[PDB]
Amino acid sequence: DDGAPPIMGSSVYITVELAIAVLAILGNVLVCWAVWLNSNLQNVTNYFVVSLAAADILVGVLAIPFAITISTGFCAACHGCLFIACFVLVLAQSSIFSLLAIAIDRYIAIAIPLRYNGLVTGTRAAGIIAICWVLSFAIGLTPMLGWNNCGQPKEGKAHSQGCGEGQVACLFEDVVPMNYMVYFNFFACVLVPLLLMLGVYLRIFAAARRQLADLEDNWETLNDNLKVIEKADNAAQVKDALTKMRAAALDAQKMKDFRHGFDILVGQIDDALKLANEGKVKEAQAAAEQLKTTRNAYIQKYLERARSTLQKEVHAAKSAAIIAGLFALCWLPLHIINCFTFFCPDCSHAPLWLMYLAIVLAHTNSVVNPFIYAYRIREFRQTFRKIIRSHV
Ligand SMILES: Nc1nc(NCCN2CCC(c3ccccc3)CC2)nc2nc(-c3ccco3)nn12
Ligand SMILES: CC(C)CCC[C@@H](C)[C@H]1CC[C@H]2[C@@H]3CC=C4C[C@@H](O)CC[C@]4(C)[C@H]3CC[C@]12C
Ligand SMILES: CC(C)CCC[C@@H](C)[C@H]1CC[C@H]2[C@@H]3CC=C4C[C@@H](O)CC[C@]4(C)[C@H]3CC[C@]12C
Ligand SMILES: CC(C)CCC[C@@H](C)[C@H]1CC[C@H]2[C@@H]3CC=C4C[C@@H](O)CC[C@]4(C)[C@H]3CC[C@]12C
Ligand SMILES: CC(C)CCC[C@@H](C)[C@H]1CC[C@H]2[C@@H]3CC=C4C[C@@H](O)CC[C@]4(C)[C@H]3CC[C@]12C
Ligand SMILES: CCCCCCCC/C=C/CCCCCCCC(=O)OC[C@@H](O)CO
Ligand SMILES: CCCCCCCC/C=C\CCCCCCCC(=O)O
Ligand SMILES: CCCCCCCC/C=C\CCCCCCCC(=O)O
Ligand code: NA
């Protein structure tokens, strides 16, 4: 009619989809290759990273070819059409499970580092990954379980396209119910987990900030109470300061040169405490001055290393949170459009070109994670360089 031949816009959409598919495959194969090759990348966190890269490889290999297919409106048995339409929901759900697992993994690592290695193992991670893939199929293919529009085929459209008996024009919104897409897929299965992830990341950053402040508080307490002892004028004041220092030292103690340093510190505090209890103020103060040598030669090195470890965990959690935020940024437009279609039947449907933009944007998310790893994680970046240099 008055509209341009459909193959022209179709050709642009399909070409862009194929470009995205190539890049999603290439980048995420590289991710999987790096983890396979580099033992420094083989940890539980990165097993979920690989599960996420696998979902993104399958966006390129399967979901994008399926999206290209369903954009034609080809004649199909309705339940086969549903599979074509819904398989991408499986991969998105799997991604959400991987993203949530990564957040939780980093929370356990910062909140209870002493039991992380005993609690979060590779064997348990592989079990969780398998369970999450099964649940992703069940959630994303729930329309194949009967929550579909196949009982109400658009017969006039099927007839105009010459479809056979029992077939429909395979179009996403004709077969997939929008109440499923909004209430079940978006609200329950996407939005709630993303808000949960946000809460987990808030807890991670709050715990890091609290632990860093506790490190500096213990350091300040050590130096303040040293001054208190130096300008004390009786044995009772030295004793009070040393008793608070001994509790802090044990509290900071909670590796061989680390343990020797705290062993020295507590012993030296005990030395001065014994002199103080005998009422020997000058001798107690001189004994407490020895603590400065231990503080410079050991304690300050522990403080710097503890701080450095925490800042690396903050940096790693920020990298993970960026990937979760980019998943939300890339998928929200499509979900929001579905909300308008569903909740505002008096509003004109979002136009075809905008839907395809939103679909392309969702698919582009399967391209971006390898770049975040390359730019933010040195161990990935260096391994990528080795693979590319040695093999391309
Ligand atoms: N909703 C939706 N559609 C499609 N494809 C059909 C596009 N067609 C939808 C109708 C539109 C139209 C415009 C003006 C007048 C009538 C009709 C044309 C354009 N694919 C999807 N994927 C996800 C999706 C996956 C995860 C969350 O949402 N929603 N969705
Ligand atoms: C392991 C991988 C590579 C295999 C991929 C198999 C895919 C391509 C197969 C599995 C099930 C198939 C669908 C099953 C039924 C129908 C209904 C029919 O009227 C049109 C084709 C259609 C829509 C098929 C398209 C192709 C399909 C999606
Ligand atoms: C054994 C594994 C590896 C195969 C992968 C399973 C998927 C891709 C295939 C296997 C069998 C397929 C189904 C076989 C037959 C039909 C009946 C038709 O009316 C609609 C499609 C539908 C419902 C297919 C949907 C997709 C399907 C579930
Ligand atoms: C997730 C972040 C980036 C926000 C994205 C907001 C996008 C998805 C929003 C902002 C403005 C919105 C549009 C505002 C008005 C209309 C006209 C109505 O007849 C159909 C929906 C439609 C076309 C909306 C679709 C969704 C929309 C494009
Ligand atoms: C934390 C944030 C990102 C959650 C996402 C917010 C979503 C659920 C919000 C943002 C804008 C909202 C839409 C804004 C306007 C309208 C038009 C109205 O006639 C029906 C509801 C509808 C369609 C809203 C539905 C819900 C909506 C899509
Ligand atoms: C149409 C059907 C298409 C096929 C869909 C199949 C989707 C299932 C894909 C699953 C990919 C999962 C890969 C994820 C692999 C993660 C690595 C791992 O778990 O190893 C850790 C342990 O070994 C350490 O002890
Ligand atoms: C690495 C393996 C990747 C798989 C390659 C497949 C790429 C082909 C892309 C899209 C499939 C085209 C489907 C055409 C729909 C039929 C149109 C119609 O019947 O009207
Ligand atoms: C569509 C919603 C899914 C419905 C709920 C399904 C219930 C599955 C829940 C948890 C799985 C727990 C893992 C148990 C592993 C058992 C392994 C074994 O028996 O050998
Ligand atoms: Na993904």
XYZ file of C-alpha atoms and ligand atoms in Angstrom:
600
model
C 0.000 0.000 0.000
C 1.123 3.523 0.902
C 3.841 1.920 3.033
C 7.254 0.981 1.696
C 7.818 -2.668 0.642
C 8.134 -4.677 3.872
C 11.364 -6.346 2.738
C 13.234 -3.017 2.956
C 12.757 -2.400 6.680
C 12.961 -6.151 7.225
C 16.401 -6.233 5.558
C 17.713 -3.531 7.907
C 16.323 -5.247 11.007
C 17.674 -8.673 9.947
C 21.109 -7.306 9.042
C 21.441 -5.575 12.421
C 20.306 -8.755 14.209
C 22.903 -10.844 12.359
C 25.655 -8.331 13.222
C 24.653 -8.535 16.893
C 24.590 -12.342 16.741
C 28.155 -12.531 15.391
C 29.500 -10.202 18.070
C 27.593 -11.941 20.889
C 29.025 -15.299 19.856
C 32.591 -14.052 19.383
C 32.889 -12.085 22.618
C 31.301 -14.668 24.855
C 33.193 -17.580 23.327
C 36.277 -15.549 24.277
C 34.993 -15.289 27.863
C 34.485 -19.072 28.072
C 37.878 -19.673 26.445
C 39.611 -17.465 29.037
C 38.077 -19.235 32.031
C 38.892 -22.652 30.542
C 42.526 -21.694 29.974
C 43.418 -19.596 33.036
C 43.364 -21.261 36.456
C 43.418 -17.787 38.026
C 39.938 -17.322 36.470
C 38.608 -20.674 37.767
C 36.520 -19.786 40.820
C 32.835 -20.015 41.676
C 32.085 -16.416 40.689
C 33.357 -17.100 37.182
C 31.390 -20.353 36.832
C 28.279 -18.161 36.929
C 30.040 -15.743 34.555
C 30.431 -18.680 32.155
C 26.782 -19.710 32.569
C 25.892 -16.112 31.683
C 28.226 -16.164 28.662
C 26.604 -19.430 27.554
C 23.157 -17.813 27.635
C 24.535 -14.952 25.541
C 26.148 -17.354 23.030
C 22.713 -18.978 22.667
C 21.164 -15.559 22.032
C 23.402 -15.391 18.958
C 23.048 -19.020 17.840
C 19.314 -19.504 18.518
C 17.346 -16.535 19.895
C 18.356 -14.141 17.136
C 17.598 -16.624 14.309
C 14.253 -17.253 16.077
C 13.558 -13.501 16.310
C 14.341 -13.092 12.602
C 11.954 -15.977 11.850
C 9.041 -14.656 13.934
C 9.346 -11.183 12.396
C 8.125 -12.711 9.101
C 4.774 -13.831 10.537
C 5.247 -17.188 8.792
C 2.475 -19.791 8.989
C 3.074 -22.264 11.813
C 1.421 -24.662 14.193
C 0.729 -22.480 17.199
C 2.731 -24.456 19.751
C 5.848 -24.509 17.564
C 5.382 -20.780 17.127
C 5.289 -20.471 20.923
C 8.650 -22.194 21.245
C 10.213 -19.835 18.681
C 8.650 -16.890 20.526
C 9.547 -17.938 24.094
C 12.991 -19.541 23.964
C 14.622 -16.097 24.396
C 12.723 -15.817 27.706
C 14.568 -18.939 28.898
C 17.920 -17.315 28.145
C 16.904 -14.046 29.798
C 15.711 -15.945 32.869
C 18.952 -17.935 33.009
C 20.866 -14.626 32.832
C 18.850 -13.231 35.735
C 19.650 -16.319 37.839
C 23.366 -16.033 37.008
C 23.389 -12.293 37.825
C 21.665 -12.932 41.156
C 24.095 -15.744 41.980
C 27.060 -13.468 41.257
C 25.665 -10.781 43.596
C 25.058 -13.283 46.392
C 28.482 -14.861 45.880
C 30.169 -11.481 46.318
C 28.034 -10.739 49.399
C 29.098 -13.989 51.081
C 32.716 -13.168 50.208
C 32.649 -9.751 51.933
C 30.387 -10.636 54.879
C 31.916 -13.954 55.939
C 35.311 -14.345 54.215
C 36.428 -16.898 56.836
C 33.776 -19.444 55.765
C 33.365 -18.509 52.088
C 35.682 -21.225 50.734
C 34.000 -23.906 52.844
C 30.491 -22.733 51.949
C 30.716 -21.779 48.261
C 32.390 -24.622 46.358
C 32.704 -25.430 42.685
C 30.624 -28.594 43.076
C 27.749 -26.738 44.736
C 27.985 -23.989 42.097
C 27.600 -26.489 39.252
C 24.523 -27.928 40.960
C 23.007 -24.468 41.382
C 23.756 -23.625 37.734
C 22.015 -26.815 36.538
C 18.976 -26.162 38.744
C 18.757 -22.588 37.500
C 18.801 -23.708 33.842
C 15.949 -26.149 34.521
C 13.957 -23.424 36.267
C 14.685 -21.029 33.381
C 13.115 -23.470 30.899
C 10.064 -23.884 33.135
C 9.600 -20.101 33.562
C 10.332 -19.077 29.970
C 8.315 -21.903 28.389
C 5.363 -21.571 30.779
C 3.156 -20.472 27.804
C 3.764 -23.929 26.260
C 2.128 -25.305 29.433
C -1.164 -23.688 28.389
C -0.838 -19.983 29.206
C -1.074 -19.019 25.554
C -3.458 -17.624 22.933
C -3.451 -20.814 20.823
C -7.072 -21.515 21.777
C -8.097 -18.187 20.168
C -6.347 -18.115 16.780
C -6.642 -14.983 14.642
C -8.428 -16.802 11.851
C -8.831 -13.843 9.501
C -5.086 -13.210 9.604
C -4.311 -16.914 9.114
C -6.658 -17.041 6.104
C -5.313 -13.860 4.498
C -1.802 -15.347 4.646
C -2.917 -18.667 3.166
C -2.040 -20.631 6.308
C -3.122 -24.237 6.507
C -5.716 -25.728 8.803
C -4.573 -25.584 12.404
C -1.886 -22.982 11.636
C -1.565 -19.321 12.602
C 0.529 -16.420 11.459
C 3.441 -16.735 13.895
C 3.507 -13.300 15.557
C 4.736 -12.716 19.106
C 1.755 -10.789 20.480
C -0.770 -13.050 18.760
C 0.418 -16.197 20.579
C 2.085 -15.012 23.850
C -0.450 -13.546 26.341
C 0.419 -10.057 27.492
C -0.772 -10.761 31.063
C 1.925 -13.478 31.116
C 4.489 -11.039 29.734
C 3.700 -8.267 32.246
C 2.673 -9.934 35.507
C 4.579 -13.215 35.369
C 7.601 -12.623 33.197
C 8.260 -8.935 33.916
C 6.968 -8.224 37.422
C 7.597 -11.580 39.089
C 10.506 -13.128 37.178
C 12.531 -10.061 36.118
C 11.697 -6.995 38.201
C 11.620 -8.737 41.600
C 15.034 -10.463 41.067
C 16.572 -7.218 39.808
C 15.302 -5.362 42.901
C 16.678 -8.205 45.034
C 20.052 -7.824 43.295
C 19.968 -4.101 44.029
C 19.385 -4.874 47.703
C 22.273 -7.362 47.719
C 24.639 -4.826 46.107
C 23.559 -2.164 48.614
C 24.437 -4.599 51.403
C 27.807 -5.419 49.790
C 28.840 -1.772 49.562
C 27.532 -0.994 53.063
C 29.514 -3.906 54.508
C 32.697 -2.815 52.713
C 32.326 0.757 53.990
C 31.710 -0.485 57.536
C 34.697 -2.845 57.456
C 37.008 -0.147 56.093
C 35.866 2.247 58.828
C 36.460 -0.431 61.462
C 40.021 -0.868 60.159
C 40.731 2.858 60.454
C 38.992 3.024 63.842
C 41.245 0.295 65.246
C 44.313 2.071 63.838
C 43.269 5.417 65.341
C 42.535 3.763 68.694
C 46.016 2.227 68.723
C 47.710 5.580 68.109
C 45.439 7.635 70.387
C 45.976 5.306 73.330
C 49.735 5.401 72.705
C 49.564 9.180 73.191
C 47.395 8.721 76.302
C 50.112 6.526 77.827
C 52.922 8.925 76.901
C 51.336 11.869 78.736
C 49.837 9.866 81.592
C 50.983 10.807 85.087
C 50.023 7.717 87.117
C 49.966 3.956 86.658
C 46.162 3.723 86.627
C 45.897 5.861 83.478
C 48.491 3.752 81.665
C 46.639 0.601 82.731
C 43.280 1.842 81.415
C 44.821 2.711 78.053
C 46.692 -0.606 77.787
C 43.598 -2.661 78.649
C 41.728 -0.972 75.794
C 44.721 -1.541 73.504
C 44.897 -5.251 74.328
C 41.213 -5.785 73.504
C 41.636 -3.909 70.210
C 44.749 -5.897 69.245
C 42.913 -9.200 69.716
C 39.967 -7.672 67.851
C 42.249 -6.663 64.970
C 43.871 -10.116 65.013
C 40.520 -11.718 64.138
C 50.000 -14.813 57.624
C 53.074 -16.125 59.433
C 54.617 -12.646 59.584
C 51.109 -11.327 60.285
C 50.684 -13.653 63.269
C 54.184 -12.914 64.571
C 53.399 -9.194 64.476
C 50.228 -9.508 66.534
C 51.981 -12.006 68.828
C 54.649 -9.371 69.502
C 52.077 -6.598 69.967
C 49.968 -8.449 72.533
C 53.057 -9.658 74.391
C 54.440 -6.123 74.542
C 51.095 -4.832 75.811
C 51.174 -7.568 78.465
C 54.712 -6.498 79.422
C 53.599 -2.898 79.949
C 50.370 -3.946 81.684
C 52.351 -5.964 84.226
C 54.615 -2.984 84.948
C 51.576 -0.706 85.250
C 49.877 -3.081 87.717
C 53.023 -2.883 89.865
C 52.775 0.916 89.913
C 55.921 1.445 87.814
C 54.731 4.287 85.582
C 57.999 5.334 83.917
C 58.932 1.709 83.231
C 55.443 0.988 81.870
C 55.577 4.017 79.552
C 58.993 3.046 78.180
C 57.690 -0.495 77.629
C 54.690 0.915 75.761
C 57.041 2.901 73.509
C 58.311 -0.425 72.147
C 54.865 -0.896 70.608
C 55.784 1.746 68.018
C 58.447 -0.507 66.513
C 55.925 -3.334 66.185
C 53.337 -0.920 64.781
C 55.672 0.342 62.054
C 57.201 -3.033 61.151
C 54.053 -5.217 61.178
C 50.710 -3.650 62.086
C 50.789 -0.902 59.459
C 51.544 -3.539 56.808
C 48.499 -5.534 57.917
C 46.352 -2.383 57.846
C 47.494 -1.526 54.319
C 46.925 -5.071 53.030
C 43.495 -5.396 54.662
C 42.450 -2.070 53.124
C 43.809 -3.132 49.731
C 41.876 -6.411 49.821
C 38.627 -4.595 50.686
C 39.110 -2.026 47.917
C 39.620 -4.855 45.407
C 36.340 -6.419 46.584
C 34.583 -3.059 46.178
C 36.042 -2.774 42.673
C 34.993 -6.315 41.751
C 31.474 -5.783 43.128
C 31.175 -2.564 41.124
C 32.122 -4.449 37.953
C 29.468 -7.104 38.637
C 26.856 -4.444 39.492
C 27.576 -2.644 36.202
C 26.786 -5.838 34.284
C 23.537 -6.326 36.219
C 22.608 -2.677 35.637
C 23.312 -2.985 31.912
C 21.072 -6.043 31.720
C 18.293 -3.930 33.255
C 18.985 -0.963 30.943
C 18.905 -3.154 27.812
C 15.751 -5.149 28.706
C 13.586 -2.547 30.456
C 12.458 -0.683 27.284
C 10.891 -3.822 25.815
C 9.174 -4.676 29.117
C 7.956 -1.107 29.534
C 6.456 -1.144 26.039
C 4.597 -4.340 26.943
C 3.243 -2.538 30.019
C 1.853 0.258 27.800
C 0.304 -2.240 25.384
C -1.275 -4.179 28.270
C -2.299 -1.439 30.739
C -3.287 1.272 28.194
C -5.524 -0.294 25.517
C -6.667 3.272 24.704
C -3.072 4.229 23.777
C -1.985 3.541 20.211
C 0.327 0.535 20.098
C 4.016 1.420 20.150
C 5.021 1.512 16.466
C 6.762 -1.303 14.634
C 10.077 0.550 14.278
C 10.216 1.213 18.040
C 9.497 -2.419 18.916
C 12.314 -3.564 16.685
C 14.609 -0.964 18.246
C 13.684 -2.312 21.688
C 14.248 -5.902 20.530
C 17.650 -5.051 19.042
C 18.627 -3.244 22.244
C 17.709 -6.283 24.351
C 19.814 -8.467 22.064
C 22.756 -6.038 22.252
C 23.075 -6.865 25.944
C 24.524 -10.212 24.855
C 27.458 -8.250 23.294
C 28.430 -6.001 26.182
C 29.657 -8.225 29.057
C 33.008 -9.298 27.444
C 33.873 -5.586 27.086
C 33.111 -4.887 30.750
C 35.320 -7.823 31.766
C 38.089 -6.626 29.432
C 37.994 -3.029 30.676
C 37.508 -3.691 34.398
C 39.139 -7.052 35.220
C 42.887 -7.236 34.586
C 43.016 -11.037 34.723
C 40.391 -11.292 31.950
C 42.021 -8.536 29.889
C 45.461 -10.176 30.042
C 44.060 -13.610 29.168
C 42.090 -12.144 26.233
C 45.347 -10.605 24.979
C 47.137 -13.957 25.205
C 44.364 -15.801 23.345
C 44.085 -13.153 20.626
C 47.862 -12.831 20.184
C 48.513 -16.578 20.233
C 45.491 -17.595 18.129
C 44.396 -14.697 15.870
N 5.659 -7.381 22.511
C 6.640 -8.056 21.820
N 6.570 -8.189 20.480
C 7.590 -8.882 19.779
N 7.402 -8.964 18.434
C 6.343 -8.444 17.678
C 6.540 -6.950 17.406
N 5.279 -6.453 16.782
C 4.295 -6.211 17.889
C 3.046 -5.505 17.385
C 3.386 -4.149 16.726
C 2.179 -3.304 16.302
C 2.278 -1.931 16.021
C 1.223 -1.127 15.613
C -0.053 -1.655 15.438
C -0.210 -3.021 15.695
C 0.871 -3.810 16.098
C 4.441 -4.461 15.659
C 5.687 -5.123 16.192
N 8.639 -9.421 20.395
C 8.721 -9.308 21.752
N 9.629 -9.747 22.640
C 9.187 -9.323 23.892
C 9.889 -9.571 25.102
C 10.882 -10.445 25.450
C 11.232 -10.215 26.848
C 10.378 -9.168 27.267
O 9.572 -8.810 26.192
N 8.031 -8.601 23.821
N 7.700 -8.603 22.512
C 20.191 -28.179 19.091
C 19.667 -27.061 18.195
C 20.756 -26.609 17.212
C 18.379 -27.505 17.489
C 17.408 -26.360 17.198
C 16.026 -26.929 16.834
C 14.983 -25.864 16.413
C 15.567 -25.025 15.260
C 13.634 -26.518 16.074
C 13.104 -27.330 17.273
C 11.570 -27.284 17.262
C 11.249 -26.616 15.915
C 9.864 -26.007 15.741
C 8.791 -27.071 16.061
C 7.473 -26.819 15.342
C 7.252 -25.834 14.456
C 5.850 -25.675 13.912
C 5.875 -25.670 12.372
O 4.567 -25.404 11.840
C 6.824 -24.620 11.875
C 8.251 -24.861 12.397
C 8.364 -24.934 13.919
C 8.230 -23.482 14.465
C 9.734 -25.500 14.293
C 10.895 -24.549 13.961
C 12.266 -25.179 14.273
C 12.419 -25.659 15.693
C 12.402 -24.454 16.700
C 16.022 -34.017 23.166
C 16.372 -32.535 23.060
C 17.879 -32.381 22.866
C 15.563 -31.854 21.945
C 15.280 -30.367 22.181
C 13.801 -30.153 22.543
C 13.028 -29.087 21.725
C 14.007 -28.246 20.903
C 11.934 -29.712 20.841
C 11.898 -31.238 20.965
C 10.479 -31.702 20.653
C 9.820 -30.419 20.157
C 8.310 -30.432 20.050
C 7.930 -31.599 19.144
C 6.566 -31.405 18.503
C 5.805 -30.303 18.633
C 4.377 -30.347 18.139
C 3.966 -29.118 17.302
O 2.532 -29.080 17.221
C 4.447 -27.837 17.922
C 5.938 -27.871 18.322
C 6.312 -29.020 19.255
C 5.561 -28.803 20.594
C 7.834 -29.097 19.466
C 8.416 -27.943 20.286
C 9.940 -28.021 20.486
C 10.453 -29.332 21.020
C 10.100 -29.442 22.531
C 14.658 1.965 30.713
C 14.900 3.450 30.482
C 16.057 3.648 29.515
C 13.624 4.162 30.015
C 13.083 3.737 28.645
C 11.723 4.425 28.451
C 10.977 4.102 27.149
C 10.874 2.576 27.052
C 9.594 4.765 27.162
C 9.689 6.285 27.383
C 8.558 6.943 26.592
C 7.664 5.769 26.221
C 6.611 5.985 25.145
C 5.690 7.124 25.594
C 4.414 7.153 24.771
C 3.988 6.139 23.986
C 2.731 6.317 23.170
C 1.759 5.139 23.376
O 0.711 5.236 22.403
C 2.435 3.791 23.211
C 3.684 3.665 24.099
C 4.698 4.802 23.900
C 5.325 4.676 22.468
C 5.772 4.713 24.993
C 6.654 3.466 24.860
C 7.723 3.390 25.952
C 8.624 4.600 25.983
C 9.390 4.743 24.634
C 12.316 0.420 39.108
C 11.582 0.691 37.797
C 12.555 0.661 36.625
C 10.474 -0.332 37.560
C 9.867 -0.205 36.166
C 8.710 0.794 36.238
C 7.522 0.449 35.317
C 6.829 -0.800 35.866
C 6.589 1.667 35.161
C 7.340 2.887 34.617
C 6.357 3.713 33.785
C 5.015 3.027 34.054
C 3.920 3.266 33.035
C 3.703 4.774 32.882
C 2.367 5.090 32.221
C 1.389 4.177 32.002
C 0.148 4.587 31.245
C -1.137 4.160 31.991
O -2.269 4.432 31.163
C -1.113 2.689 32.309
C 0.138 2.340 33.130
C 1.476 2.737 32.470
C 1.699 1.861 31.198
C 2.624 2.561 33.473
C 2.882 1.086 33.825
C 4.116 0.873 34.703
C 5.377 1.562 34.220
C 5.851 0.902 32.880
C 16.887 -25.767 21.614
C 17.826 -26.284 22.706
C 19.112 -25.467 22.814
C 20.056 -25.966 23.901
C 19.715 -25.305 25.233
C 20.563 -25.865 26.365
C 20.828 -24.840 27.451
C 21.658 -25.460 28.566
C 23.036 -24.811 28.562
C 23.788 -24.841 29.642
C 25.167 -24.186 29.597
C 25.790 -24.255 30.982
C 27.295 -24.015 30.977
C 27.748 -23.461 32.325
C 29.055 -24.083 32.788
C 29.578 -23.433 34.061
C 30.942 -24.002 34.439
C 30.813 -25.020 35.564
O 29.745 -25.216 36.037
O 31.927 -25.725 36.039
C 32.134 -25.585 37.416
C 32.551 -26.946 37.960
O 32.969 -27.698 36.855
C 33.696 -26.853 38.971
O 33.563 -27.891 39.905
C 26.519 -20.945 14.185
C 25.114 -21.387 13.740
C 24.135 -20.208 13.629
C 22.821 -20.557 12.906
C 22.711 -19.950 11.490
C 21.274 -19.580 11.072
C 21.125 -18.149 10.504
C 19.846 -17.974 9.662
C 19.003 -16.808 10.127
C 17.648 -16.798 10.179
C 16.691 -17.911 9.797
C 15.736 -17.408 8.732
C 14.299 -17.881 8.894
C 13.419 -17.526 7.709
C 11.940 -17.600 8.016
C 11.082 -18.138 6.879
C 10.280 -17.036 6.184
C 8.919 -17.525 5.726
O 8.664 -18.742 5.722
O 8.014 -16.728 5.337
C 7.812 -23.064 37.514
C 8.211 -22.995 38.996
C 8.981 -24.237 39.492
C 8.267 -25.019 40.612
C 9.140 -25.445 41.813
C 10.065 -26.646 41.551
C 10.748 -27.180 42.833
C 12.286 -27.341 42.764
C 12.968 -26.609 43.904
C 14.232 -26.821 44.355
C 15.256 -27.828 43.845
C 16.222 -28.154 44.976
C 17.426 -29.020 44.606
C 17.341 -30.447 45.137
C 18.333 -31.411 44.508
C 17.925 -32.884 44.541
C 18.899 -33.786 43.770
C 18.610 -35.276 43.875
O 17.484 -35.689 44.207
O 19.499 -36.140 43.624
Na 21.973 -12.395 28.819
